[PDB]
Write a protein that binds this DNA or RNA. Sequence first.
DNA 1: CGGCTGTACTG
DNA 2: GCCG
Length: 318
Amino acid sequence: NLHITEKLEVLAKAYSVQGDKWRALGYAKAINALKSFHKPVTSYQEACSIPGIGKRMAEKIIEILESGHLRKLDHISESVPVLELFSNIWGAGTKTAQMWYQQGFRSLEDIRSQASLTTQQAIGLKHYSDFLERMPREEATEIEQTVQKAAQAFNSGLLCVACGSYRRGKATCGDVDVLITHPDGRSHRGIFSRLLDSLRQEGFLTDDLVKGETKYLGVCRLPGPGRRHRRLDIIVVPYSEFACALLYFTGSAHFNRSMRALAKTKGMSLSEHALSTAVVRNTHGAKVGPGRVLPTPTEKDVFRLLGLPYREPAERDW
DNA sequence: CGGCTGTACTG
DNA sequence: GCCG
Ligand SMILES: [Mg+2]
Ligand code: NA
């Protein structure tokens, strides 16, 4: 199924970029369902059947089948392509894009010349094209290795794992996500600092976007002709959290959200730090009592404790 | 009626 | 947008 989704994707993005996040979530989930459906969809009654598809989406499917068109798609605001242009700048989202629009900016030349950018947005605009591009998974390999090689030059016992789409076995990667830990659980942050320093000194790191104590995002470029600037995310964790970190950083993101949402129905909470149980939540679903951390030395343990069958990373790409 | 994941960083 |  891609006949009807292609038309939905355009509404999903229109909604997302105008900041209607939940309606856009509705569309996103429906789109997902339709894609993992075996056969093409035939009846409005078959429509409702599919979890993630209700009356409103059913009617729209019907129109796509009956008319081969979507009336809502010709009513999309003329501002949408511009809002998408703007929020493809790293560091600029829905609010900033809509503000810029209101203020009369219609193009990246307008932003470049007339807009006051944060440090992150200026780096984002500089790399606008490169950030929209995916790298072959083989290039990800060279980057993980460059990072790993450099880390292991401080403390050779450090473990570096490439995560995200790479670990899920995808042929291309939007960025490289490197997870760093140490088996003693005591080795952190003296490294993470100096590590970035050498990588920056080797000329490998071109720009910094986020520098936190355990988390880094920046821009690197491998040496040589024909190389593009790439996004590189690095996080350091204590060995205690290694498995929950690995699970999180590997994703996919829709998978993390599904997992976490299930954990919530079981009175549990899952995050990059821990899976914990006996979590106390107020009526709005917000966490109040922290509950207690459940032991989780491997990804297997996390699935198990949730009552789920183990998925290897490739089966996580939702 | 109202949640839809949970966390971190920046200014 | 969908659903419990
Ligand atoms: Mg990634
Ligand atoms: Na952005």
